[PDB]
Ligand binder design. Structure first.
Ligand code: XAX
Ligand SMILES: O=C(O)c1ccccc1O
Lengths: 67, 67
């Protein structure tokens, strides 16, 4: 049986920064763009869940297309 | 008094390329238009898809003049 601890952050301080860009179109559909990429880890899935919670709207009105 | 109408005669006529991305109704369009917004909406409405799915790109027009 083995434990682990693992430090969270970039050890270069200036990399710990992050931008997003959001548009709401006139049918109310939402386009989210942020600096992260999807490699299978479900980042975009998580970002849609965060946006839907923050905006108080269904996930079906929110979309992430690409980085 | 009467005044006759007029043809725009932009040297470049109307033109559109549409790329369907195969995922979630996404479509990317290159179009000779003064109105990328209404282009985006009209295409979304015809497809029965949210606006956030449709991307319109306009580099330049060979004339528009309102036409
Ligand atoms: N070379 C060239 N010049 C042009 C145009 C053009 O296609 N080519 N057309 C006009 C029109 S027609 Mo209209 O209200 O949509 S009826 S307004 C308008 C105007 C739009 O351009 P801003 O001046 O707002 O940047 O450009 C003018 N000059
Ligand atoms: O500290 C890290 O884990 C790290 C990871 C990726 C790139 C630069 C970094 O400092």
């Amino acid at each position: 049986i083995i434990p682990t601890k693992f430090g969270i952050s970039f050890t270069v301080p200036f990399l710990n920064q992050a931008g997003a860009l959001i548009h709401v179109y006139t049918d109310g559909s939402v386009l989210v763009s942020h600096g992260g990429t999807e490699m299978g880890q479900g980042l975009h899935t998580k970002m849609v869940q965060v946006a839907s919670k923050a905006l108080k709207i269904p996930i079906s009105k929110i979309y992430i297309s690409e980085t | 008094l009467y005044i006759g109408g007029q043809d725009h005669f932009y040297l470049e006529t109307h033109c559109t390329i549409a790329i369907p991305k195969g995922e979630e109704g996404e479509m990317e369009l290159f179009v000779s238009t003064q109105n990328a917004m209404k282009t985006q909406s009209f295409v979304a409405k015809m497809l029965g898809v949210p606006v956030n799915r449709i991307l319109v790109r306009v580099k330049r027009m060979g004339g528009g003049f309102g036409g």
